[PDB]
Amino acid sequence: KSPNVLLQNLCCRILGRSEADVAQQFQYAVRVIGSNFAPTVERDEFLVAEKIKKELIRQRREADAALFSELHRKLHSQGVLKNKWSILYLLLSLSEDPRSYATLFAQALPRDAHST
Amino acid sequence: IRRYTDQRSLDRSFGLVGQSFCAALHQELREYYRLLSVLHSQLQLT
Amino acid sequence: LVHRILPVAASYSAVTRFIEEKSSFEYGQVNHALAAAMRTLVKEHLILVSQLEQLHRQGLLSLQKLWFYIQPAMRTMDILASLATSVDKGECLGGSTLSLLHDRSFSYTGDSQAQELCLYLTKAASAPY
Amino acid sequence: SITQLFDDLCEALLPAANRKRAKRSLKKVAYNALFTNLFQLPARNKILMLSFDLRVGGLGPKADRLEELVEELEAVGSVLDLLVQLAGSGPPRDYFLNNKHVGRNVPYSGYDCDDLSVFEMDVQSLISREECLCHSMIQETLQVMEAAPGTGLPTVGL
Amino acid sequence: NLNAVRETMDVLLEISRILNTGLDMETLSICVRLCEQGINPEALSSVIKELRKATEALK
Amino acid sequence: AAAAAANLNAVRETMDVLLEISRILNTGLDMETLSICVRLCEQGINPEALSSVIKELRKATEALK
């Protein structure tokens, strides 16, 4: 597929309803995926690996934090994914705690100090 | 701009609103360095 | 230009010597708890230089990029070294260095970069008391 | 009838210069292609995918205008379905955007300097035209000054 | 009412202009009245593209 | 041929590894939605953009229930 029909498939995945019914949300999605689409900042998977470790330390779970290391190794052992940074950032952002802040914690470089 | 920041950050009685003024002289120095980075990247031409 | 960049390394060494020496039981549980929270920021200092290593390996970094990149963490380590020197000079332990931190918390308010930092350090060190 | 209006459509795509009898024969190719389809997702999502195709290529307010114009078009329904099929079938600045010296209550964002680089392309496009002109005048004369004689004149060829 | 159906067709003209069709004002008026009869637009997409090609063989 | 199925195997492994990652952080998404997300991430996309969309679209289905 192309991305433009694929965002519709996402709109049909999470909502049960038809795509001729809900088109306001698909319209709101198309604005935000468009015009901020492709990577424009520097990708680094190691910082995201350490932040998946910091999330699993935030649960105080050290065993899966060591399981994540061999999974993170296996992702590079196969090497059939174009953006390793994206899916780990994505999955880290979508975490849910069964049962902080980030103005002291330093992120990636934006390539706004570097020419595009 | 920078001599004043060099003085006020080593002046230990300048208040906390004069030391907020001097923090508005920190933001526009860090932005200056961002600009200079953009310049240097485009030199790797006159 | 190199001379301008040199003071932050002294403001690293002063911090790590503090973290070694004043975590001992002669210096009290609140200094233990404070050194346990400044330990996190040393790790966060390692965080940046790893990414910068990755970029320098990729055939690209200059001194002017570097100088800009290290500015937000340049202020932090300055605050850390000053605070550790202040705790050393009075030999503050126990409740004296909850008096000092109660003062320092009001002392830094401006720019709000350091306000979060000192607030986290005083909330972290205050548990045993 | 409608069979006359297909020939009017046949008259529109013909520019004026036989030549009314070529028309009635092109009318047959129009009928032979009308029944090829007859032999062998609402409207508004199709607007969203092309608005997306715009927005990835930059130029955000232009998508924001196309959606506003089809909004009052959704307030005749069969003709936009034709318009989504034809796309590229034809022929193959203001100082209130990137300026803060003017405005009334102008906001602040500091410098961007990544549209200043597309403000140098704003000059490179002007230079690419006025170099294409000097490419299109030395060629149209070298094609006539170089040949055997009698290639620019039809009357010598008789 | 003929002023309203005029302004809506004018709005119809511009969104087919920036999508860069070859249809002009009169071809759009023809196509709108042909679609109003009940003619399938999916076939009109074929007959216009064939007619514009066969026109160039005459010139 | 055969190598065109061997690479299908080499991605069939990775789709399990990302599934284990996804479940130990526990998204409220399953394998089929995740296939749309990996299809999106192959062409190149910002997770800061996509994740916000997912946070909005989940607040559209319990507003019609």
Coordinates of C-alpha atoms in Angstrom, one line a residue:
Chain A
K1 CA 0.0 0.0 0.0
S2 CA 0.7 3.7 0.0
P3 CA 0.8 5.7 3.3
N4 CA -2.3 7.7 2.5
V5 CA -4.5 4.6 2.4
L6 CA -2.6 3.1 5.3
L7 CA -3.6 5.9 7.7
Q8 CA -7.1 5.0 6.8
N9 CA -6.4 1.4 7.7
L10 CA -5.2 2.7 11.1
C11 CA -8.4 4.7 11.4
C12 CA -10.3 1.4 10.7
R13 CA -8.2 -0.6 13.2
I14 CA -8.7 1.4 16.4
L15 CA -12.2 2.5 15.7
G16 CA -14.6 -0.3 14.9
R17 CA -16.8 2.0 12.8
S18 CA -16.7 2.4 9.0
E19 CA -14.5 5.0 7.3
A20 CA -17.4 6.7 5.7
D21 CA -18.8 7.3 9.1
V22 CA -15.8 8.7 11.0
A23 CA -14.0 11.1 8.6
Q24 CA -13.5 14.0 11.0
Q25 CA -10.9 12.1 13.0
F26 CA -9.3 10.8 9.8
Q27 CA -9.2 14.5 8.7
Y28 CA -7.5 15.4 12.0
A29 CA -5.0 12.6 11.6
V30 CA -4.1 13.5 8.0
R31 CA -3.0 17.0 9.1
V32 CA -0.7 15.8 11.8
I33 CA 0.9 12.9 9.9
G34 CA 1.3 15.1 6.9
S35 CA 3.8 18.0 7.0
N36 CA 5.7 16.3 9.9
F37 CA 6.0 13.0 8.2
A38 CA 9.6 11.9 7.6
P39 CA 12.6 11.9 10.0
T40 CA 14.1 15.3 10.4
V41 CA 16.0 14.7 13.7
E42 CA 18.9 12.4 14.4
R43 CA 18.0 8.8 15.1
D44 CA 19.9 7.0 17.9
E45 CA 18.7 3.6 19.1
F46 CA 21.0 3.4 22.1
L47 CA 19.4 6.3 24.0
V48 CA 16.0 4.8 23.3
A49 CA 17.4 1.5 24.6
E50 CA 18.5 3.1 27.8
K51 CA 15.2 4.8 28.1
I52 CA 13.3 1.5 27.8
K53 CA 15.7 0.5 30.6
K54 CA 14.7 3.6 32.5
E55 CA 11.0 2.8 32.0
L56 CA 11.5 -0.7 33.3
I57 CA 13.5 0.6 36.2
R58 CA 10.5 2.9 36.8
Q59 CA 8.4 -0.3 37.4
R60 CA 11.4 -1.6 39.4
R61 CA 11.6 -4.7 37.1
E62 CA 15.2 -5.7 36.4
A63 CA 14.7 -9.1 34.8
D64 CA 12.9 -7.9 31.6
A65 CA 15.3 -5.0 31.5
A66 CA 18.0 -7.7 30.9
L67 CA 15.6 -9.6 28.5
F68 CA 15.3 -6.4 26.5
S69 CA 19.0 -6.5 25.8
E70 CA 18.9 -9.8 24.0
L71 CA 15.8 -8.7 22.1
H72 CA 17.6 -5.4 21.2
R73 CA 20.6 -7.5 20.0
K74 CA 18.3 -9.7 17.9
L75 CA 16.8 -6.7 16.1
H76 CA 20.3 -5.9 14.8
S77 CA 21.2 -9.5 14.2
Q78 CA 18.5 -9.9 11.6
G79 CA 18.6 -6.3 10.2
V80 CA 15.5 -6.2 8.0
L81 CA 14.0 -3.0 9.4
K82 CA 14.9 0.3 7.9
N83 CA 14.2 2.4 11.1
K84 CA 15.1 0.6 14.3
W85 CA 14.8 3.9 16.2
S86 CA 11.2 4.5 15.3
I87 CA 9.5 1.3 16.5
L88 CA 11.4 1.4 19.8
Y89 CA 10.5 5.0 20.3
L90 CA 6.9 4.2 19.4
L91 CA 6.6 1.2 21.7
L92 CA 8.3 3.1 24.5
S93 CA 5.8 6.0 24.1
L94 CA 2.8 3.6 24.2
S95 CA 3.7 1.9 27.5
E96 CA 1.1 1.2 30.1
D97 CA 1.8 0.5 33.8
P98 CA -0.2 -2.3 35.4
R99 CA 0.8 -1.6 39.1
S100 CA 7.9 11.3 35.5
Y101 CA 9.2 14.5 33.9
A102 CA 11.8 15.2 31.2
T103 CA 13.1 18.7 31.7
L104 CA 16.1 17.2 33.5
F105 CA 16.6 14.4 30.9
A106 CA 18.4 15.1 27.6
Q107 CA 17.1 14.1 24.2
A108 CA 18.4 13.7 20.7
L109 CA 19.9 16.3 18.3
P110 CA 17.4 18.0 16.0
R111 CA 19.5 18.8 12.9
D112 CA 18.4 22.4 13.3
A113 CA 22.0 23.2 14.3
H114 CA 23.1 21.1 11.2
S115 CA 22.2 21.9 7.6
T116 CA 19.4 19.7 6.1
Chain B
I1 CA 26.2 41.6 25.7
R2 CA 28.7 39.1 27.0
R3 CA 30.8 41.3 29.3
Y4 CA 27.7 42.1 31.4
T5 CA 26.8 38.4 31.6
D6 CA 30.4 37.8 32.7
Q7 CA 30.0 40.4 35.4
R8 CA 26.5 39.5 36.7
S9 CA 27.1 35.8 36.9
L10 CA 30.1 36.5 39.1
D11 CA 28.2 39.2 41.0
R12 CA 26.8 37.3 44.0
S13 CA 24.4 40.1 45.1
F14 CA 22.3 40.9 42.0
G15 CA 19.0 39.8 43.4
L16 CA 16.8 37.1 41.9
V17 CA 15.1 39.2 39.2
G18 CA 18.4 40.7 38.1
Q19 CA 19.5 37.1 38.1
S20 CA 16.4 36.4 36.0
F21 CA 17.3 39.3 33.7
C22 CA 20.8 37.7 33.3
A23 CA 18.9 34.4 32.4
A24 CA 17.3 36.3 29.6
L25 CA 20.9 37.0 28.6
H26 CA 21.6 33.3 28.7
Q27 CA 18.8 32.3 26.3
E28 CA 19.9 34.7 23.7
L29 CA 23.5 33.5 23.9
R30 CA 22.5 29.9 23.5
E31 CA 20.4 30.9 20.5
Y32 CA 23.3 32.8 19.1
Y33 CA 25.4 29.6 19.4
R34 CA 22.6 27.7 17.5
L35 CA 22.8 30.3 14.7
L36 CA 26.6 30.0 14.6
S37 CA 26.3 26.2 14.3
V38 CA 23.9 26.7 11.3
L39 CA 26.5 29.0 9.8
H40 CA 29.5 26.7 10.3
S41 CA 27.6 23.8 8.8
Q42 CA 27.1 25.9 5.6
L43 CA 30.7 26.7 5.4
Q44 CA 31.6 23.0 4.9
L45 CA 31.3 28.7 0.6
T46 CA 31.5 32.5 0.9
Chain C
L1 CA 38.4 28.4 22.1
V2 CA 39.5 25.2 23.9
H3 CA 40.3 27.3 27.0
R4 CA 36.7 28.4 27.1
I5 CA 35.5 24.8 27.1
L6 CA 37.9 23.5 29.8
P7 CA 36.1 24.7 33.1
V8 CA 33.3 22.1 32.8
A9 CA 35.8 19.2 33.2
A10 CA 37.0 20.6 36.5
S11 CA 33.3 21.0 37.4
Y12 CA 33.1 17.2 36.7
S13 CA 36.1 16.1 38.7
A14 CA 35.0 18.1 41.8
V15 CA 31.6 16.3 41.6
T16 CA 32.9 12.8 41.3
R17 CA 35.3 13.2 44.2
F18 CA 32.4 14.4 46.4
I19 CA 30.3 11.4 45.4
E20 CA 33.2 9.1 46.4
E21 CA 34.2 10.7 49.6
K22 CA 31.0 11.9 51.3
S23 CA 28.9 8.8 50.8
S24 CA 30.6 7.3 53.8
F25 CA 28.7 6.7 57.1
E26 CA 30.7 9.4 58.8
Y27 CA 28.9 12.0 56.7
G28 CA 25.3 11.0 57.5
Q29 CA 22.3 9.5 55.8
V30 CA 21.1 12.7 54.2
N31 CA 24.5 13.1 52.5
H32 CA 24.1 9.5 51.5
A33 CA 20.7 10.3 50.0
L34 CA 22.0 13.4 48.3
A35 CA 25.0 11.6 46.8
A36 CA 22.7 8.9 45.5
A37 CA 20.7 11.6 43.6
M38 CA 23.8 13.4 42.2
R39 CA 24.9 9.9 41.0
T40 CA 22.1 9.9 38.5
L41 CA 23.3 13.1 36.9
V42 CA 26.8 11.7 36.4
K43 CA 25.1 8.9 34.4
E44 CA 23.1 11.6 32.5
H45 CA 26.5 13.2 31.7
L46 CA 27.6 9.9 30.2
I47 CA 24.4 9.9 28.2
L48 CA 25.4 12.9 26.1
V49 CA 29.0 11.9 25.3
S50 CA 27.8 8.6 24.0
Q51 CA 25.6 10.2 21.4
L52 CA 28.4 12.6 20.5
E53 CA 30.8 9.7 20.1
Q54 CA 28.3 8.1 17.6
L55 CA 28.1 11.4 15.7
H56 CA 31.9 11.9 15.6
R57 CA 32.3 8.3 14.3
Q58 CA 29.9 9.4 11.5
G59 CA 32.5 11.8 10.1
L60 CA 30.7 14.9 11.4
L61 CA 31.2 17.1 14.4
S62 CA 32.8 20.5 14.9
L63 CA 33.8 22.5 18.0
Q64 CA 31.1 25.0 17.4
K65 CA 28.4 22.4 17.3
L66 CA 29.9 20.8 20.5
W67 CA 30.1 24.1 22.3
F68 CA 26.4 24.7 21.6
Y69 CA 25.5 21.1 22.6
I70 CA 27.1 21.2 26.0
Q71 CA 25.5 24.5 27.1
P72 CA 22.4 23.2 29.0
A73 CA 24.5 20.7 30.9
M74 CA 27.3 23.3 31.5
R75 CA 25.1 25.2 33.9
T76 CA 24.1 22.1 35.8
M77 CA 27.5 20.9 36.7
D78 CA 28.4 24.4 37.8
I79 CA 25.5 24.3 40.3
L80 CA 26.6 20.8 41.5
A81 CA 30.3 21.7 42.1
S82 CA 29.3 24.9 43.9
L83 CA 26.8 23.1 46.2
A84 CA 29.3 20.3 47.0
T85 CA 32.0 22.9 47.8
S86 CA 29.5 24.7 50.1
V87 CA 28.6 21.4 51.9
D88 CA 32.3 20.6 52.3
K89 CA 33.3 24.0 53.7
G90 CA 30.9 23.9 56.6
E91 CA 31.1 20.2 57.0
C92 CA 27.3 20.1 56.7
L93 CA 25.6 16.9 57.7
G94 CA 22.3 15.9 59.1
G95 CA 20.0 18.9 59.6
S96 CA 22.5 21.6 58.8
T97 CA 22.4 20.4 55.1
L98 CA 18.6 20.5 55.2
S99 CA 19.0 24.1 56.4
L100 CA 21.4 24.7 53.5
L101 CA 19.1 23.1 50.9
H102 CA 16.0 24.9 52.3
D103 CA 17.9 28.1 51.7
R104 CA 19.3 27.0 48.3
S105 CA 15.8 26.1 47.1
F106 CA 14.6 29.6 47.4
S107 CA 18.0 30.9 46.3
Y108 CA 17.7 29.5 42.7
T109 CA 14.4 30.3 41.1
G110 CA 15.4 32.1 37.9
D111 CA 15.8 30.4 34.4
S112 CA 13.9 27.4 35.9
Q113 CA 16.6 25.1 34.7
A114 CA 18.2 24.9 38.1
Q115 CA 15.0 25.2 40.1
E116 CA 13.9 21.7 39.0
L117 CA 17.5 20.4 39.8
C118 CA 17.7 21.8 43.3
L119 CA 14.1 20.8 44.0
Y120 CA 14.8 17.2 43.0
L121 CA 18.0 17.2 45.1
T122 CA 16.3 18.5 48.2
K123 CA 13.3 16.2 47.9
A124 CA 15.7 13.2 47.4
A125 CA 18.0 14.0 50.3
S126 CA 15.2 14.7 52.8
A127 CA 13.8 11.1 53.2
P128 CA 16.0 9.9 56.2
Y129 CA 15.4 13.0 58.2
Chain D
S1 CA -30.0 15.5 -27.2
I2 CA -27.1 14.0 -25.2
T3 CA -25.5 12.7 -28.4
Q4 CA -25.0 16.4 -29.4
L5 CA -23.4 17.2 -26.1
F6 CA -20.8 14.5 -26.6
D7 CA -20.0 16.2 -29.9
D8 CA -19.9 19.5 -28.0
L9 CA -17.3 17.9 -25.7
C10 CA -15.6 16.8 -29.0
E11 CA -15.7 20.5 -30.0
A12 CA -14.2 21.8 -26.8
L13 CA -10.9 19.8 -26.9
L14 CA -10.5 20.7 -30.6
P15 CA -8.9 24.1 -31.0
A16 CA -10.1 26.1 -34.0
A17 CA -7.9 26.5 -37.1
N18 CA -12.2 18.4 -43.3
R19 CA -11.8 20.1 -39.8
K20 CA -15.5 19.7 -39.1
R21 CA -15.4 16.1 -40.5
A22 CA -12.4 15.1 -38.4
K23 CA -14.7 16.1 -35.5
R24 CA -17.5 13.6 -36.4
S25 CA -14.9 10.8 -36.7
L26 CA -13.2 11.7 -33.4
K27 CA -16.8 11.5 -32.0
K28 CA -16.6 7.8 -32.8
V29 CA -13.4 7.2 -30.8
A30 CA -15.2 9.0 -28.0
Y31 CA -18.0 6.5 -28.3
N32 CA -15.7 3.5 -28.6
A33 CA -14.0 4.5 -25.4
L34 CA -17.3 5.3 -23.6
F35 CA -18.4 1.7 -23.8
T36 CA -15.1 0.1 -22.9
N37 CA -15.8 0.9 -19.2
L38 CA -19.5 0.1 -19.6
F39 CA -18.4 -3.3 -21.0
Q40 CA -15.7 -3.7 -18.3
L41 CA -15.1 4.8 0.8
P42 CA -17.0 8.0 0.1
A43 CA -16.1 11.0 -1.9
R44 CA -14.5 13.0 1.0
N45 CA -11.7 10.5 2.0
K46 CA -10.4 10.8 -1.6
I47 CA -10.0 14.5 -0.9
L48 CA -8.0 13.6 2.3
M49 CA -5.4 11.5 0.4
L50 CA -4.7 14.2 -2.1
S51 CA -4.5 16.8 0.7
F52 CA -2.0 14.4 2.3
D53 CA 0.0 14.2 -0.9
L54 CA 0.2 18.0 -0.9
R55 CA 1.1 18.3 2.8
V56 CA 4.1 15.9 2.5
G57 CA 5.4 18.1 -0.3
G58 CA 5.3 21.0 2.0
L59 CA 3.0 24.0 1.4
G60 CA 0.5 23.5 4.1
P61 CA -2.1 26.3 3.7
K62 CA -2.7 25.1 0.1
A63 CA -4.1 21.9 1.4
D64 CA -6.0 23.9 4.0
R65 CA -7.6 25.9 1.1
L66 CA -8.5 22.8 -1.0
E67 CA -10.3 21.3 2.0
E68 CA -12.2 24.6 2.6
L69 CA -13.3 24.8 -1.0
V70 CA -14.6 21.2 -1.1
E71 CA -16.4 21.9 2.2
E72 CA -18.7 24.4 0.5
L73 CA -18.9 22.1 -2.5
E74 CA -20.2 19.4 -0.1
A75 CA -22.8 22.0 1.1
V76 CA -23.4 18.3 -9.0
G77 CA -22.2 15.6 -6.6
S78 CA -21.2 13.3 -9.5
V79 CA -18.7 15.7 -11.0
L80 CA -16.1 15.7 -8.2
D81 CA -15.8 11.9 -8.8
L82 CA -14.6 12.9 -12.3
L83 CA -12.3 15.5 -10.8
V84 CA -10.5 12.9 -8.6
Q85 CA -9.7 10.8 -11.6
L86 CA -8.1 13.6 -13.7
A87 CA -4.9 14.6 -11.9
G88 CA -2.0 15.8 -14.0
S89 CA -3.9 15.0 -17.3
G90 CA -3.5 18.6 -18.4
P91 CA -0.2 20.4 -19.3
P92 CA 2.9 19.0 -17.6
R93 CA 6.5 36.8 -1.8
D94 CA 4.2 38.5 0.6
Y95 CA 6.0 40.0 3.7
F96 CA 3.6 38.7 6.3
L97 CA 4.8 35.1 6.6
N98 CA 8.6 35.1 7.3
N99 CA 8.9 38.6 8.7
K100 CA 8.5 40.1 12.1
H101 CA 9.4 43.7 11.3
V102 CA 5.7 44.1 10.4
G103 CA 2.3 42.9 11.7
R104 CA 0.1 44.3 14.4
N105 CA 0.4 41.9 17.4
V106 CA 3.1 39.8 15.7
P107 CA 4.2 36.7 17.7
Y108 CA 7.7 35.6 18.5
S109 CA 9.5 32.3 17.6
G110 CA 13.0 33.6 17.1
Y111 CA 14.9 32.8 13.9
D112 CA 14.0 29.7 11.8
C113 CA 16.7 29.9 9.0
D114 CA 15.4 26.8 7.2
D115 CA 13.1 28.8 5.1
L116 CA 15.9 31.3 4.5
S117 CA 17.5 28.5 2.6
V118 CA 14.3 28.1 0.5
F119 CA 14.6 31.9 0.1
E120 CA 17.8 31.3 -1.9
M121 CA 15.8 28.8 -4.0
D122 CA 13.4 31.6 -4.4
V123 CA 16.2 33.3 -6.4
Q124 CA 17.5 30.1 -8.0
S125 CA 14.1 29.6 -9.6
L126 CA 14.3 33.1 -11.1
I127 CA 17.8 32.4 -12.4
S128 CA 16.7 29.0 -13.8
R129 CA 14.2 30.8 -16.0
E130 CA 16.4 33.5 -17.3
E131 CA 19.0 30.9 -18.1
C132 CA 16.4 28.7 -19.9
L133 CA 15.6 31.7 -22.1
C134 CA 19.2 32.0 -23.2
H135 CA 19.0 28.2 -23.8
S136 CA 15.9 28.6 -26.0
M137 CA 17.1 31.4 -28.3
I138 CA 20.5 30.0 -29.3
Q139 CA 19.0 26.6 -30.2
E140 CA 16.1 27.9 -32.3
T141 CA 18.6 29.6 -34.6
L142 CA 21.3 26.9 -34.7
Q143 CA 18.5 24.5 -35.9
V144 CA 18.0 26.8 -39.0
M145 CA 21.5 28.1 -39.6
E146 CA 22.8 24.5 -39.7
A147 CA 21.5 22.5 -42.7
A148 CA 21.8 22.4 -46.4
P149 CA 20.0 25.4 -47.9
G150 CA 16.2 25.0 -48.5
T151 CA 15.1 23.5 -45.2
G152 CA 13.6 26.7 -43.7
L153 CA 11.8 27.6 -46.9
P154 CA 8.9 25.5 -48.3
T155 CA 9.1 27.3 -51.6
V156 CA 12.6 26.1 -52.4
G157 CA 11.3 22.6 -51.9
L158 CA 9.1 22.9 -55.0
Chain E
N1 CA -31.2 30.3 -8.1
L2 CA -29.1 30.6 -11.2
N3 CA -26.6 32.8 -9.3
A4 CA -26.0 30.1 -6.6
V5 CA -25.5 27.3 -9.1
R6 CA -23.1 29.7 -10.9
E7 CA -21.0 30.3 -7.8
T8 CA -20.8 26.6 -6.9
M9 CA -19.6 25.8 -10.4
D10 CA -17.0 28.6 -10.1
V11 CA -15.8 26.9 -6.9
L12 CA -15.8 23.7 -8.9
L13 CA -13.5 25.3 -11.5
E14 CA -10.6 26.2 -9.2
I15 CA -10.1 22.8 -7.5
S16 CA -9.8 21.2 -10.9
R17 CA -7.3 24.0 -11.8
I18 CA -4.9 23.4 -9.0
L19 CA -5.1 19.6 -9.5
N20 CA -3.9 20.5 -13.1
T21 CA -6.6 19.0 -15.3
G22 CA -6.9 20.0 -19.0
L23 CA -10.5 20.9 -18.6
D24 CA -11.3 24.6 -19.1
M25 CA -14.5 26.6 -18.3
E26 CA -16.6 25.3 -21.3
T27 CA -15.4 21.7 -21.0
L28 CA -16.4 21.8 -17.3
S29 CA -19.8 23.1 -18.1
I30 CA -20.2 20.3 -20.7
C31 CA -19.0 17.7 -18.2
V32 CA -21.3 18.9 -15.3
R33 CA -24.4 18.8 -17.6
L34 CA -23.3 15.4 -18.8
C35 CA -22.9 14.1 -15.3
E36 CA -26.3 15.5 -14.4
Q37 CA -28.0 13.2 -16.9
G38 CA -26.6 10.1 -15.2
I39 CA -23.5 9.4 -17.3
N40 CA -20.8 7.5 -15.4
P41 CA -17.8 9.8 -14.8
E42 CA -15.4 6.8 -14.8
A43 CA -15.9 6.5 -18.6
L44 CA -15.8 10.2 -19.2
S45 CA -12.2 10.1 -17.8
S46 CA -11.4 7.8 -20.7
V47 CA -13.1 9.6 -23.5
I48 CA -11.5 12.9 -22.7
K49 CA -8.0 11.4 -22.5
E50 CA -8.5 9.7 -25.8
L51 CA -9.9 12.7 -27.5
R52 CA -7.1 15.0 -26.4
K53 CA -4.6 12.5 -28.0
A54 CA -6.4 12.1 -31.3
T55 CA -6.7 15.9 -31.5
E56 CA -2.9 16.2 -31.7
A57 CA -2.8 13.8 -34.7
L58 CA -4.7 16.4 -36.7
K59 CA -2.4 19.3 -35.9
Chain F
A1 CA 11.8 -18.3 -5.2
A2 CA 13.5 -19.7 -2.1
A3 CA 15.5 -16.7 -0.9
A4 CA 12.4 -14.6 -1.4
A5 CA 10.9 -16.9 1.2
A6 CA 14.1 -16.9 3.3
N7 CA 13.8 -13.1 3.7
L8 CA 10.1 -13.6 4.6
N9 CA 11.4 -15.9 7.3
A10 CA 14.0 -13.3 8.4
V11 CA 11.2 -10.7 8.9
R12 CA 8.8 -13.4 10.3
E13 CA 11.3 -13.7 13.2
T14 CA 11.6 -9.9 13.8
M15 CA 7.8 -9.6 14.0
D16 CA 7.9 -11.9 16.9
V17 CA 10.7 -10.0 18.7
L18 CA 8.8 -6.7 18.3
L19 CA 5.7 -8.5 19.6
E20 CA 7.6 -9.5 22.8
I21 CA 8.9 -6.0 23.2
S22 CA 5.3 -4.7 22.7
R23 CA 3.8 -7.0 25.3
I24 CA 6.4 -6.5 28.0
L25 CA 5.7 -2.7 27.9
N26 CA 2.0 -3.6 27.3
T27 CA 0.4 -1.5 24.6
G28 CA -3.3 -1.6 24.2
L29 CA -2.8 -2.7 20.6
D30 CA -2.6 -6.2 19.1
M31 CA -0.8 -7.8 16.3
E32 CA -3.0 -6.6 13.4
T33 CA -2.9 -2.9 14.3
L34 CA 0.8 -3.4 15.0
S35 CA 1.2 -4.6 11.4
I36 CA -0.1 -1.2 10.3
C37 CA 2.4 0.5 12.6
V38 CA 5.4 -1.5 11.2
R39 CA 4.2 -0.8 7.7
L40 CA 4.1 2.9 8.6
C41 CA 7.6 2.8 10.2
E42 CA 9.2 1.2 7.1
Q43 CA 8.6 4.3 4.9
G44 CA 9.9 6.6 7.7
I45 CA 7.7 8.4 10.2
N46 CA 8.0 10.4 13.4
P47 CA 6.8 8.5 16.5
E48 CA 6.1 11.9 18.1
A49 CA 3.7 12.4 15.3
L50 CA 2.1 8.9 15.1
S51 CA 1.8 8.2 18.9
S52 CA -0.2 11.4 19.3
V53 CA -2.6 10.2 16.6
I54 CA -3.1 6.9 18.5
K55 CA -3.8 8.9 21.6
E56 CA -6.5 10.8 19.8
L57 CA -8.1 7.9 17.9
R58 CA -8.5 6.0 21.2
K59 CA -10.5 9.0 22.4
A60 CA -13.0 8.7 19.6
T61 CA -14.3 5.1 20.1
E62 CA -15.3 5.5 23.8
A63 CA -17.1 8.7 22.8
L64 CA -19.6 6.8 20.6
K65 CA -20.0 4.0 23.1

